[PDB]
Amino acid sequence: VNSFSGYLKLTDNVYIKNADIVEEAKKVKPTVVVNAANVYLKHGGGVAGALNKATNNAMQVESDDYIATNGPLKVGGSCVLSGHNLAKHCLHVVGPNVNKGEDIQLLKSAYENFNQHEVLLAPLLSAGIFGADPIHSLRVCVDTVRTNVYLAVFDKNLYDKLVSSFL
Numbered sequence: 820v821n822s823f824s825g826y827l828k829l830t831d832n833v834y835i836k837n838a839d840i841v842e843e844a845k846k847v848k849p850t851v852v853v854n855a856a857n858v859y860l861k862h863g864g865g866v867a868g869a870l871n872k873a874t875n876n877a878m879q880v881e882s883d884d885y886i887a888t889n890g891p892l893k894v895g896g897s898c899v900l901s902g903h904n905l906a907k908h909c910l911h912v913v914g915p916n917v918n919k920g921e922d923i924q925l926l927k928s929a930y931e932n933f934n935q936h937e938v939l940l941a942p943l944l945s946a947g948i949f950g951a952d953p954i955h956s957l958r959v960c961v962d963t964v965r966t967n968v969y970l971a972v973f974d975k976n977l978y979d980k981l982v983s984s985f986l
């Protein structure tokens with residue numbers, strides 16, 4: 820038993836809710852919140868900008884030190900940093916950004932990072948400003964992630980569509 824509420828169950832291990840991931844994180848304080856990161860951990864917009872704003876820019880400060888030490892992530896890769904006031908940990912995961920021409924097949928590699936964590940609160944990778952089809956992203960999620968994932972979908976219209984079209 821865990822503290823997530825109001826989710827629709829899609830499969831044995833994947834759940835979905837129309838929610839603002841920032842507000843969901845602040846209420847649940849999950850062990851892991853996933854950020855829709857880029858390779859530079861520059862949290863300007865989308866999910867990343869919103870999560871970072873909710874940490875009063877502490878996420879960005881920590882991220883800049885990480886990059887200065889380690890260099891950029893790989894597309895499809897991840898790193899674990901602090902969750903600040905939102906979660907114990909933040910798993911920064913880089914899905915391919917279609918608006919940069921990145922290979923969509925890297926989306927499966929990105930979701931594989933979730934399997935290193937037993938339970939996660941997450942957005943749909945490569946959705947939103949990353950330009951991928953969220954329905955495809957949900958399919959890859961279901962077919963790749965084996966651990967327990969609670970997906971927060973900000974847009975109510977997109978949420979209902981994702982549910983109504985789910986196979």
Ligand SMILES: Cn1ncc2c(=O)[nH]c(CCC(=O)N3CC[C@@H](C(=O)O)C3)nc21
Nearest residue numbers: 839840841865866869942947971972973
């Ligand atoms: C602090 N605060 N107060 C009012 C408002 C507001 O109306 N919007 C935002 C930006 C929120 C945002 O961009 N995302 C949340 C989920 C997400 C996704 O893409 O899943 C993108 N922050 C606010």
